[PDB]
């Protein structure tokens, strides 16, 4: 039939794509990076412990000044932290307590918040009335909202397998990104804010162009769902954490995998992934209550941050690169260094 | 507090007021019962919610107790990616229709509907997030049951069943079949109830079961249990 002919043609085209990908591979990153000086061992002490949340913390985002923090917890609260003096600047109550993501505007003016309510609320921190009020509620997703990132433009991902670029001034989706066959779990925004990447439970990560709304590339290789994703600081590499206890480093230019970071002693999935300021270290929060810190340019492990009493839910490194925040289901954030 | 500026002291005072407000809010939110309502298609949840867009929250008040009912029927997604958000609920209200003998799935007519609900019950009772949350098992539409059983033998669903084809004897068999799926017999307790469409004691049964769960939890965290 016509359908069968199209399916076999697509299979042949995928075979051609695979052959093209494997024809450009000469040496793994671990063979070119075999003569460099190893990092060794990295020790980080808990400089700050941020307490005040009365439930599991699911979201956390760093401000662009590397001082202010925002964190979202299931007790219906969005708290903004000084993170130097441990002071609380704002405490925002949510209409829906089932929050699973939050974002901080790069200008420090707005905060985004979403969850199982299918709605992305946007709050204005700097008003003349002295209170934080809902500037705009964005609706149109039919599945749970998993990630949101500011670009008056915000890009969100949902559990309905579609992403959406919005316009906060109007309130309607200016672009809709489709092509994922499973729930989209994580978003990552390039340092140039022109190409973003979303990973899905399809065990695939897609690279989308914001201006055209067209999927540039698709990366596969995981054997389970993708929970966290990030860019290399120069915006030319991936960092995906999946449920099969492996992290992976995909390359945009080569359209190919470079490194897999895994160890036998780890059997649980990765919940959060982040790099360091220079991209030499790769942090990764795990289900077994701790946060490993891998050497990213090589493949070896470097350190462990095991000062948490529950699953590490969210992770983040400052823009300056001085500190690392880490949230968990035990309701405490910890600033390391 | 000796090297702080005046604005630093004022900021610390503001933070302390924020903590006071957060503590009061969290104390007010810990005195209210949270029940997660599950079920299958056309099981009878519509009658259950009347007799007492993402998540559908429902408020209720009985005696001096407040209840928050979290209907999750309208959210079609991957369940294992958001079900742990409901870890810590007081109880799981699972509604099953007893009229699922001659009824079959529209997508697959060859598959029975009762087994389809048993699969969901097994998946949610044996889940790794609800190893200590009690289940209130409601069995709805017992008026259609007592008239369907006389013309359609129950043996169609259960080839291994052997007993009298009456209501009072088949109800016990179906209750035992549903209750046997619990592999944690010591941490979880199932409170089965047989209800009709026009019964007004469902909310009292829910109140009794949740008071029992509260008593057991208080005995557990005090060390006596």
């Amino acid at each position, epitope marked *: 039939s016509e359908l069968d002919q199209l399916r076999q043609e697509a299979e042949q085209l995928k075979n051609q794509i695979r052959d093209a990908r494997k024809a450009c591979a000469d040496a793994t990153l671990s063979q070119i990076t075999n003569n460099i000086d190893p990092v060794g061992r990295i020790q980080m002490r808990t400089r700050r412990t941020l307490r005040g949340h009365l439930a599991k913390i699911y979201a956390m985002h760093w401000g662009t000044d590397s001082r202010l923090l925002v964190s979202a917890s299931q007790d219906g609260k969005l708290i903004i932290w000084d993170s130097y*003096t441990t002071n609380k600047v704002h405490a925002i109550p949510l209409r829906s307590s089932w929050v699973m993501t939050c974002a901080y505007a790069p200008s420090g003016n707005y905060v985004a918040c979403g969850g199982l309510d299918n709605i992305c609320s946007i709050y204005n921190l700097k008003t003349r009335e002295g209170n934080v009020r809902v500037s705009r509620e964005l609706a149109g997703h039919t599945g749970y909202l998993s990630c949101c990132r500011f670009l008056n433009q915000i890009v969100t991902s949902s559990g309905d397998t579609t992403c959406a670029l919005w316009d906060i001034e109007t309130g309607q989706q200016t672009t809709t990104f489709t092509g994922h066959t499973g729930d989209v779990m994580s978003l990552s925004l390039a340092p140039d804010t022109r190409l973003f990447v979303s990973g899905a439970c399809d065990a695939s990560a897609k690279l989308w162009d914001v201006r055209e709304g067209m999927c540039r590339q698709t990366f596969t290789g995981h054997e389970s769902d993708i929970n966290a994703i990030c860019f290399f600081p120069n915006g030319n590499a991936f960092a995906t954490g999946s449920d099969d206890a492996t992290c992976r480093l995909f390359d945009l230019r080569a359209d190919q995998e470079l490194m897999t970071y895994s160890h036998d002693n780890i059997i649980c999935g990765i919940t959060s992934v982040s790099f360091s300021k220079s991209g030499r270290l790769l942090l990764a929060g795990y289900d077994d209550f701790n946060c490993n810190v891998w050497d990213a340019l090589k493949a070896d492990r470097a350190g462990v941050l095991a000062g948490h009493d529950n699953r590490v839910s969210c992770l983040g490194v400052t823009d300056d690169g001085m500190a690392v925040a880490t949230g968990s289901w035990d309701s405490f954030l910890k600033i390391w260094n | 507090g000796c090297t702080l*500026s005046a*604005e630093d002291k*004022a900021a610390v*005072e503001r933070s302390k007021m924020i903590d006071r407000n957060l503590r009061e809010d969290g104390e007010k939110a810990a005195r209210e019962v949270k029940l997660l309502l599950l079920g299958a298609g056309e099981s009878g949840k519509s009658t259950i919610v009347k007799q007492m867009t993402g998540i559908v929250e429902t408020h209720f008040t009985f005696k001096d107790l407040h209840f928050k009912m979290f209907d999750v029927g309208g959210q079609r997604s991957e369940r294992k990616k958001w079900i742990h958000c409901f870890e810590g609920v007081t109880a799981i209200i699972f509604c099953v229709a007893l009229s699922d003998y001659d009824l079959v799935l529209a997508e697959d007519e060859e598959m029975n509907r009762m087994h389809e609900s048993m699969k969901l019950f097994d998946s949610i009772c044996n889940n790794k997030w609800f190893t200590d949350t009690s289940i209130i098992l409601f069995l709805n539409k017992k008026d259609l049951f007592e008239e369907k059983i006389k013309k359609s033998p129950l043996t169609i669903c259960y080839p291994e069943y052997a007993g009298s084809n009456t209501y009072e004897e088949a109800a016990a068999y179906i209750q035992c079949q549903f209750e046997d799926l619990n592999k944690r017999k010591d941490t979880k307790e199932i409170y089965t109830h047989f209800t009709c469409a026009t019964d007004t004691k469902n909310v009292q049964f829910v109140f009794d079961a949740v008071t029992d769960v509260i008593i057991k939890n208080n005995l557990k965290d005090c060390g006596l249990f």
Partner: single-chain antibody
Amino acid sequence: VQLVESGGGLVQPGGSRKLSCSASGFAFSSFGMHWVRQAPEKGLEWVAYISSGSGTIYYADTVKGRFTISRDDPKNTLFLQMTSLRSEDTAMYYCVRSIYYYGSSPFDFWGQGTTLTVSDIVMTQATSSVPVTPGESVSISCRSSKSLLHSNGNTYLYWFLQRPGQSPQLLIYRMSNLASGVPDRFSGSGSGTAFTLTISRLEAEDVGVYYCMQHLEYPLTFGAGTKL
């Protein structure tokens, strides 16, 4: 946002009075409040301060024991009860809202004034008048007794502006940050104990008196000010 004041008028010496400020248009329960007067000598003088949750009250050393400041949140009011009004208490009392967290402007909005006629770091400011025709840049200088730069990096200097027939308004907070709605023509700079305010293009809306104030510690002291 609005603060409307009442309770003034002529009072015989030795008596007592009460000044009431009503807030309309903002979350009054989360704002600390100040009472700041101004004698006919054109010198602003901080009088009293009450915290956001009424958990902290400060007074100027001159008025302690005679002035009581108290806020009421449900009806959004601020009261100053004045007892034994001496002849040096003739002024025009202003009420100022103030908010303190990381990155805020603690003196943005001022009240409108209540006439009342009865029958420490020192701030030395440059001069009393700077006659400059519009079109050219104007520089004003201000000096303190000791350094205002704290160990945390902040220098607590505030530059205000009072137009003829109006209440003051915030121009610059912490010596370098420009207030909201203030054009970028004004800018502030300096270091240690010496501070300057420069206006690149003076226009007809910059005429008035300028004041430099410190917020390093209480009491808060205002500069004499320079007329433009």
